[PDB]
């Protein structure tokens, strides 16, 4: 909107009321915290959301960081442009005084004049009339400046990491600015989101632009360069494995490019190869790029870092700080099993709880926005773009790590609960510190992080995908550089030919089986429809469900004990994943 001085009106009972004043300068709206207390400001032809606040000094900025930089030099005539409610604007001159506790004008102005600009002879704002003598309220240091984006990053053989911390305006401003630039430059453009719900949020921010969401139910879909493709990471990788009609995108943008999921890692591998070939430009957006090991990064809004005991199971006494908290809380658990116990403990105390996991995310997450709740109990999945209007994060900093055991018959176990990585701790904490609130957001944690993901099964599974992905030219795709030495797996040792490769893709896509487990079955020469391997494993490969031995009724109508030839912990780690794998073993999908 237009630069100048604005009355801040509040629609109350039987009429609007000037609760304050504000100054829009260089594109951002400045005022005082006690006037709007974080609330959104409505304009005809516009919407204004807060971006920065200093509650202690009573200041708040809309649409960017504080930009008023001029200050008052003692013994200088100032001028308060007083905007009193129901009265015409007035220029009042006076000579201000001195400080006392950690420059105040002796002007008596009605309540509602708070936020009126204080101006020197140069017509620059040197402060805001506020705290009733009334102190010339000014920020010690301005922004927190400008953008995070908009160079000539649209060049072949250039890959850009955008380190965008929450509150950056990534989705609302940065991403649509990128797409507009790509379309001006006539670049065939692909956008990659970690989840459907995030992809849907991109569609909203990108409204008005030629965007097309690409379902994984389809191997390829082509109109032309004028259409921008949008899809989940996993969708892109499955297409790379399923189709030879993958378009040679000129610009590939990956959001939440830290996602350690095998499909996501393989995607960053292929993407990087395309950039290297001189074919494409790529942009990886993440607040924790490779090399970032600070659990406590900066945030656009202050975060209170509190370290104390956190329960891993149901409690009965000693943790009143958990349930006495008035606001909303996001709690990160090491597993769904752990999540269910915590959630039930909280629900027993009358707390409304939403639970989140990988497979329930796209159906449960929309409830956090719409319905009213107290706690979110989530797995590491919410480390990829999940946004919450919460004030607190409870983070025991623990997780389960899938590991391929080589001692004895090869199998995948879930090690832990083990301490999370520094990046993950930063992402978890990063759920808060976004939106200015009266009290600082709280990050309640326990334990230190650990850089021990070198034996993580995901890096090997990514290579099982990668050397089963071809490029039209013949070039071999490897892991993204900074991730390349996170596995000791040999290159092209997981390559599959012919129908083996086809089965491998189908075991993953239609079977919903883990990459490792899919690869083992496929390289064995087993057909997709055949499920006899689910019952012919060794006794020690027996699968348990709630302390009881699983017994499946086959498609034929036979009752056999569930006992896979290859054991992968992730297919029985939770009632839902097991329920799914039993549908597979029965041959119902």
């Amino acid at each position: 909107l237009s630069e100048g001085v604005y009355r801040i009106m509040q629609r109350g009972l039987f009429g609007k009321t000037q609760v304050g004043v504000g100054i829009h300068m260089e594109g951002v709206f400045h005022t005082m915290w006690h006037v709007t207390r974080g609330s959104v400001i409505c304009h005809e032809t516009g919407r204004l959301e807060p971006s920065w606040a200093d509650v202690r000094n009573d200041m708040i900025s809309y649409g960017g960081g504080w930009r008023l930089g001029d200050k008052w030099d003692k013994e200088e005539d100032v001028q308060v442009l007083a905007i009193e409610p129901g009265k015409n604007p007035k220029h009042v001159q006076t000579k201000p005084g001195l400080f006392k506790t950690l420059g105040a004008v002796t002007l008596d102005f009605k309540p509602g004049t708070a936020g009126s600009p204080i101006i020197n002879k140069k017509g620059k704002v040197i402060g805001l009339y506020g705290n009733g003598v009334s102190a010339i309220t000014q920020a010690e240091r301005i922004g927190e400046p400008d953008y995070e984006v908009d160079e000539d990053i649209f060049r072949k053989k250039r890959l850009t990491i955008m380190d965008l911390h929450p509150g950056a305006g990534k989705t609302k401003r940065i991403l649509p600015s990128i797409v507009r630039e790509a379309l001006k430059r006539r670049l065939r453009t692909l956008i990659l989101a970690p989840t459907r719900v995030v992809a849907a949020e991109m569609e909203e921010a990108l409204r008005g632009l030629p965007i097309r969401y690409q379902t994984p139910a389809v191997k390829s879909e082509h109109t032309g360069r004028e259409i921008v493709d949008l899809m989940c990471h996993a969708t892109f990788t499955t297409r790379l494995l399923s189709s030879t009609r993958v378009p040679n995108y000129n610009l590939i943008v990956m959001d939440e490019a830290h996602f350690t999921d095998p499909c996501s890692v393989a995607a960053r591998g292929y993407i990087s190869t395309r950039v290297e070939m001189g074919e494409a430009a790529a942009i990886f957006m993440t607040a924790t790029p490779p090399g970032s090991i600070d659990p406590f990064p900066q945030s656009n809004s202050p975060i209170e870092d509190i370290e104390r005991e956190i329960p891993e199971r149901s409690w009965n006494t000693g943790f009143d700080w958990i349930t006495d908290y008035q606001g909303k809380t996001v709690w990160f658990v090491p597993s769904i099993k752990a999540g269910n116990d915590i959630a039930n403990c909280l629900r027993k105390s009358g707390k409304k709880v939403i639970q989140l996991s990988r497979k329930t995310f796209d159906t449960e997450y929309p409830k956090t926005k719409l319905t009213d709740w107290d706690f979110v109990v989530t797995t590491d999945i919410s480390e990829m773009g999940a946004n919450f209007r919460a004030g607190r994060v409870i983070d025991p900093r623990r997780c389960l790590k899938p590991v391929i055991l080589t001692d004895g018959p090869e199998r995948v176990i879930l090690a832990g609960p083990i301490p999370v990585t520094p990046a993950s701790a930063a992402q978890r904490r990063g759920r808060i510190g976004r939106n200015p609130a009266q009290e600082d957001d709280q990050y309640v944690f326990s334990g230190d992080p650990l850089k021990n993901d070198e034996d993580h099964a995901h890096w090997t599974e990514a290579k099982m995908l990668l050397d089963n992905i071809y490029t039209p030219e013949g070039i071999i795709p490897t892991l993204f550089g900074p991730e390349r030495e996170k596995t000791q797996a040999i290159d092209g040792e997981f390559r599959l030919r012919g129908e083996q490769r086809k089965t491998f893709v189908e075991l993953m896509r239609r079977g919903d089986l883990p990459v490792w487990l899919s690869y083992k079955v496929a390289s064995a020469g087993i057909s997709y429809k055949d499920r006899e391997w689910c019952f012919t494993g060794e006794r020690n490969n027996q699968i348990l469900e709630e302390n009881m031995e699983v017994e499946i009724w086959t498609r034929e109508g036979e009752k056999k004990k569930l006992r896979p030839k290859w054991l992968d912990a992730r297919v029985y780690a939770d009632p839902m994943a097991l329920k799914d794998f039993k549908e597979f073993a029965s041959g119902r999908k």
Binding site: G4, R7, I83, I119, N120
Partner: peptide
């Protein structure tokens, strides 16, 4: 969520 803006004046010094 019920705040709005109406413009009053511009940043200037008075003669």
């Amino acid at each position: 969520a019920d705040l709005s803006l109406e413009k009053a004046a511009n940043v200037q010094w008075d003669e």
